[PDB]
Amino acid sequence: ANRFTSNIKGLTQAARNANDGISVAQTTEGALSEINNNLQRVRELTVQAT
Amino acid sequence: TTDPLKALDDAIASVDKFRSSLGAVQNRLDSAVTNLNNTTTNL
């Protein structure tokens, strides 16, 4: 039972940690989306300029 | 520190070993007390 107690605590903490990685992925995806919008606008302007 | 969690598990098992041995000794002592009470009554 001591071994289950340790296992349960570790697994719960690991899930809590994984949530942080999910948050990091979401934030970086938002930044990448902003960069993508800028790139598409630049592409359209290059089309208009050539 | 390298390999922390395995060392922590080793320490936890090492203290569990001592606790289990102590509990076994408690059971033995209780059995001894019971036998001594019976022997005293009979004598």
Binding site: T28, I35, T46, A49 | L5
Partner: peptide, 27 residues
């Protein structure tokens, strides 16, 4: 236990690392 990791890769994204360094449409 130990070594229970999921690897996230992060790539440096900027003008230099995208080929758009010095991009001009004029002289």
């Amino acid at each position: 236990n130990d070594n229970q990791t999921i690897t996230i890769d992060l790539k440096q994204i900027d003008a230099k690392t995208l080929g758009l360094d010095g991009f001009s449409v004029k002289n």
